[PDB]
Amino acid sequence: MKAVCVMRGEEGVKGVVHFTQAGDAVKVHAEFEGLKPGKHGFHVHEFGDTTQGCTSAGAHFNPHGKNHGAPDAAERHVGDLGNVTAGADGKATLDLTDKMISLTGEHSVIGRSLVIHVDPDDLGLGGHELSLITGNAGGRVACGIIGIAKSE
Amino acid sequence: MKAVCVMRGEEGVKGVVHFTQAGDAVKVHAEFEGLKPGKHGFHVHEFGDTTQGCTSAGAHFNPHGKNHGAPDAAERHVGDLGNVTAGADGKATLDLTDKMISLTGEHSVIGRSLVIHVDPDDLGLGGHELSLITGNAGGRVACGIIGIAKSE
Numbered sequence: 001m002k003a004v005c006v007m008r009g010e011e012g013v014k015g016v017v018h019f020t021q022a023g024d025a026v027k028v029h030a031e032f033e034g035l036k037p038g039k040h041g042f043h044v045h046e047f048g049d050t051t052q053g054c055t056s057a058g059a060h061f062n063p064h065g066k067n068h069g070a071p072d073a074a075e076r077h078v079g080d081l082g083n084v085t086a087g088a089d090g091k092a093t094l095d096l097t098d099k100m101i102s103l104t105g106e107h108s109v110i111g112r113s114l115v116i117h118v119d120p121d122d123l124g125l126g127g128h129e130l131s132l133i134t135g136n137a138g139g140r141v142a143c144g145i146i147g148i149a150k151s152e
Numbered sequence: 153m154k155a156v157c158v159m160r161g162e163e164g165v166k167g168v169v170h171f172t173q174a175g176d177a178v179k180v181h182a183e184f185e186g187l188k189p190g191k192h193g194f195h196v197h198e199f200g201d202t203t204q205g206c207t208s209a210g211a212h213f214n215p216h217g218k219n220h221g222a223p224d225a226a227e228r229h230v231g232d233l234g235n236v237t238a239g240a241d242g243k244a245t246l247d248l249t250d251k252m253i254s255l256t257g258e259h260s261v262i263g264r265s266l267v268i269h270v271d272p273d274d275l276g277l278g279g280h281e282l283s284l285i286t287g288n289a290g291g292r293v294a295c296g297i298i299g300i301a302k303s304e
């Protein structure tokens with residue numbers, strides 16, 4: 001099973017993100033250009049709604065109502081995929097394996113949204129009231145809808 | 153259960169389409185501007201892939217291997233939602249109930265694409281080589297990925 005998400009928002013920011021269901025895990029391959037050098041929070045938000053740009057994407061996909069956290073943490077949202085690190089040339093690549101999200105079933109992220117943020121995801125540890133909620137990653141630089149892709 | 157699809161394409165063409173499911177019946181509500189007057193084929197295509205504009209949307213969503221038909225025909229693709237009619241000023245509106253598509257299960261259209269065509273869907277009767285495949289509706293004026301929406 002395969003998924004793709006093309007991400008857009010602020011001028012110059014471009015992102016493509018491939019997903020591949022591999023048994024009980026999903027492999028994620030994401031690339032970006034046009035980012036500010038440094039770390040950017042990267043999440044699956046709940047809605048595939050772009051009627052209000054990235055704003056209508058809602059909050060972090062959290063079907064279990066748990067606290068925000070790191071991809072590798074005990075407590076986290078299904079949609080918590082950490083930070084994307086933008087290099088000096090404003091470009092980033094991120095590969096990961098996540099057994100939280102799915103391309104099928106109740107954890108499916110099909111038809112939901114990917115959002116990349118202005119600031120870093122403090123991963124629930126920032127000591128800010130937003131930390132266990134959004135990771136305090138600030139505003140939404142680009143977002144996109146997760147659509148079914150050709151499962152070759 | 154709700155779903156939304158923001159459609160976009162050639163200069164000027166805008167479109168928003170809301171889905172609401174109750175039981176086996178999906179209400180499809182569409183508002184378009186910027187179209188050429190007359191009928192435009194209107195289908196759910198298989199992929200929510202926008203890596204190559206609307207081209208990567210693939211062909212019509214057809215999980216049961218049927219020929220193309222009108223929405224109310226004996227035989228049709230799941231994704232066959234017929235024609236949208238654009239007025240003399242380019243505006244169009246559609247409100248149709250369909251019991252083939254779904255926002256869930258094997259017929260789920262979540263994360264697939266909505267496409268609108270430059271020419272009319274001949275409903276599989278136009279007697280042309282592409283009639284029973286695509287309804288001979290020609291190129292693609294606009295599309296969007298169908299995303300999960302606030303169900304309220």
Ligand SMILES: [Cu+2]
Nearest residue numbers: 041042043115
């Ligand atoms: Cu986020």
Ligand SMILES: [Cu+2]
Nearest residue numbers: 193195267286
């Ligand atoms: Cu079509």
Ligand SMILES: [Zn+2]
Nearest residue numbers: 029030031093
């Ligand atoms: Zn790549």
Ligand SMILES: [Zn+2]
Nearest residue numbers: 060068077080
């Ligand atoms: Zn979170």
Ligand SMILES: [Zn+2]
Nearest residue numbers: 063064106107
């Ligand atoms: Zn669960």
Ligand SMILES: [Zn+2]
Nearest residue numbers: 212220229232
């Ligand atoms: Zn068809």
Ligand SMILES: [Zn+2]
Nearest residue numbers: 215216258259
């Ligand atoms: Zn069926």
